Amino acid sequence: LGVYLTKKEQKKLRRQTRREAQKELQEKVRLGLMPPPEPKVRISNLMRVLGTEAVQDPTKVEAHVRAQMAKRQKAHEEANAARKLTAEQRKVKKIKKLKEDISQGVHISVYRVRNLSNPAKKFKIEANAGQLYLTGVVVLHKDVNVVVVEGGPKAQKKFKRLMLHRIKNKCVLVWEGTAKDRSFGEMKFKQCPTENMAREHFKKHGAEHYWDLALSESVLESTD
């Protein structure tokens, strides 16, 4: 892998590049491939540079210096425009489409919310998994809201503080681990009034131990 050279040689290399460019430009101008650089002039330099020639036709001279200013500003603006490709192309396809590198292992977080009736929270949560491209499953039951989110590690890190610190009845991640392959499909909701209907749907993807852990944690909290 590469190494990160320090700021001293950063400045040194930048100075080498700029001096290289300046000397190459000066050699080309000495050859004459481009005209010698006309003195850059502003309003404050208007009478310093061209004043003697600016007395005869002042408005022409100020028009010329403003034209030079406009040409410089236009060169800058269209240089930015030529360099401006990530603004739209990357925006969401090359600057926000990452997927958290979930190729060899999918981080899975199983949370148990005691109260999740609010559709707002559900909507936001699902919405939060759509932009992060994280898979998930949510089973609703009597005082047991199991949510198994399987996605990338960055999406699992961003969703850990979303359900614990950004959304409010308590939510606790009962199991945080990785898997060899993805088990759950898209983020869909399904109502299960009985534990058998949730356990049969969890047995379709082999996630019956996630519901069995939540059913054991919901009974251990009622003792003490």
Partner: peptide, 11 residues
């Protein structure tokens, strides 16, 4: 001009 272009390529 060939000398300048070969210098700038070689650099």
């Amino acid at each position: 001009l060939a000398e300048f272009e070969r210098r700038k390529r070689a650099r």
